[PDB]
């Protein structure tokens, strides 16, 4: 064909197929859900373990790009690490130049510009990772955003990415997250993850949950172990009775 | 010559319109203009029919971007 091997050429209908292949590569990966509560943002991701030989907690898709900002990953993990490093250094440059905590929308705009600049030319390929950014502060509330490799940065009350994204956002929509507090949000997110795990289509899995909000005093962090290890517990009462 | 064209229906404002209108479709223009006139139960065609009648049939919008010109 000769009009799909470059990121700078155009299809006759007005489309780029390199970024579409990037979208397909992203959706090949597993799922991840970001949710905005009344006070903060909760991230829930499931990761498939490939073998028991891993020492557990390897390549966790949740990263702390800022002290007050967390982020979730689906797609290709090396590009995710590069984007995480870029986000960290850009927040560093902001708070060096300006001297305060960077707004989530601003850094989302900057990483959107960065990921869209690599779509412009043909010397660099489009990225293969879609990610979510969550933050909370008292000056602006709880903020959530989602960015695809093509560069679309949209805010969400609750967003999902992955293979089971359809049923994930289906069961996101059937909850009134605007009225539930973070403790309920944890159990809801865990339940949705267990539903969309799909069991037979994959091997054994592991759960990763991350917090930002006033309960964590605005500083993003992972969930405590005591708040953990109960996801399976209220899963097993909420499993289907056949 | 076989139509109503009551008192003021202009034609020379339509002869100046470009984009190479063929010969057969003028018959179509008059025909569907009369269709428009008879749909509103009016026995005399008015000038307010012809502009929408004209834009009904030709419909060739631009097919050539202007910076190229």
């Amino acid at each position: 064909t000769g009009y799909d091997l470059s990121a700078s050429t155009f299809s006759p209908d007005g489309r780029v197929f390199q970024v579409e292949y990037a979208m397909k590569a992203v959706e090949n990966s597993s799922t991840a859900i970001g949710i905005r509560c009344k006070d903060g943002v909760v991230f829930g991701v499931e990761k498939l373990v490939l073998s028991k030989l891993y020492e557990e907690g390897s390549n966790k898709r949740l990263f702390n790009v800022d002290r007050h900002v967390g982020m979730a990953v689906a797609g290709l993990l090396a590009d995710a690490r590069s984007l995480a490093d870029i986000a960290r250094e850009e927040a560093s440059n902001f708070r060096s130049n300006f001297g305060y905590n960077i707004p989530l929308k601003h850094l989302a705009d900057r990483v959107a510009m960065y990921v869209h600049a690599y779509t412009l030319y043909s010397a660099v390929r489009p990225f293969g990772c879609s990610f979510m950014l969550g933050s909370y502060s008292v000056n602006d509330g709880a903020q959530l955003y989602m960015i695809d490799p093509s560069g679309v940065s949209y805010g969400y009350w609750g967003c999902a990415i992955g293979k089971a994204r359809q049923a994930a956002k289906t069961e996101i929509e059937k909850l009134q997250m605007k009225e539930m507090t973070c403790r309920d949000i944890v159990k809801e997110v865990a339940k949705i993850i267990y539903i969309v795990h799909d069991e037979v289509k994959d091997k054994a899995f592991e759960l990763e949950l991350s917090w930002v909000g006033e309960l964590t005093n605005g500083r993003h962090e992972i969930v405590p172990k005591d708040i953990r290890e109960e996801a399976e517990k209220y899963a097993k009462e909420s499993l289907k009775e056949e | 010559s076989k139509m109503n064209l009551s008192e003021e229906v202009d034609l020379e404002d339509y002869v100046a319109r470009p984009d190479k209108i063929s010969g057969a479709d003028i018959n179509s223009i008059c025909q569907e203009s009369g269709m428009l006139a008879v749909r509103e139960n009016r026995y005399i065609v008015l000038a307010k029919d012809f502009e929408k009648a004209y834009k009904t049939v030709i419909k060739k919008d631009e097919q050539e971007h202007e910076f190229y010109k």
Partner: protein, 238 residues
């Protein structure tokens, strides 16, 4: 090696990629229309939300490019925001190195040259969005300009940009044939009815974005929902 992939002249010099970019703009199923009144200018853009999960305040295609000029985009969103930021950069650069509010034509000309040097060379995507500016200039009144990725522009009494382009232009032309000193609420009523008869949807007030810049209020502003539904019920009976 043939130019159907890279920006080179053809037999009869047809640069296929620029019409390809125009079709890429028309890929995004949205439309905007700009109408200049006697002392006002209005941009009316429709929007669609797939679900209630997304924050509707986050989706906006109207942007306050400067305090007195407004801009609106059509195409893929990321490139749209990118050239918004570039126009913002050049406007701030002009204000810093000259010291006055840049006229709309100069922003339009500079980013037209940017689009021209995009499409001039190879190894660079020639961009896939179209642009509308609305503003006020001293001793000139309201100005409405449009840019393409090819770098072309012109001056318009009123224009539109989107998928449903042509019927919008025809309706606008048959309305401006009886122009006769368009007034502010009448301009926004005509623009709303134009968008409605183009889309044939009879939109509710919470599906639209309206931006009006006026001689009376030279600062560019964004219409809120209350005055949107007030103008809708003003245009409900007529």
């Amino acid at each position: 090696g043939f130019d159907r992939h890279i920006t080179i002249f053809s037999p009869e010099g047809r640069l296929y990629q620029v019409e390809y970019a125009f079709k890429a703009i028309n890929q995004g199923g949205l439309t905007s229309v700009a109408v200049r009144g006697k002392d006002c200018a209005v941009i009316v853009t429709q929007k669609k939300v797939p679900d209630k999960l997304l924050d509707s305040s986050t989706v906006t295609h109207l942007f306050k490019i400067t305090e007195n000029i407004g801009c609106v985009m059509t195409g893929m969103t990321a490139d749209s925001r990118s050239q918004v930021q570039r126009a913002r950069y050049e406007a701030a650069n002009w204000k810093y190195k000259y010291g006055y509010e840049i006229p709309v034509d100069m922003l339009c000309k500079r980013i037209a040259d940017i689009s021209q040097v995009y499409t001039q060379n190879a190894e660079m995507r020639p961009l896939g969005c179209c642009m509308i500016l609305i503003g006020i200039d001293e001793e000139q009144g309201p100005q409405v300009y449009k840019c393409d990725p090819a770098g072309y522009y012109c001056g318009f009494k009123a224009t539109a940009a989107g998928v449903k382009q042509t019927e919008s232009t025809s309706f606008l032309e048959k309305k401006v044939k009886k122009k006769f000193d368009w007034t502010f609420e009448q301009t926004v009523e005509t623009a709303i009815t134009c968008l409605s008869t183009v889309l044939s949807i009879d939109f509710k007030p919470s599906e639209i974005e309206v931006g009006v810049v006026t001689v009376e209020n030279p600062k560019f502003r964004i219409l809120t929902e209350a005055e949107i539904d007030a103008h809708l019920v003003a245009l409900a009976e007529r």
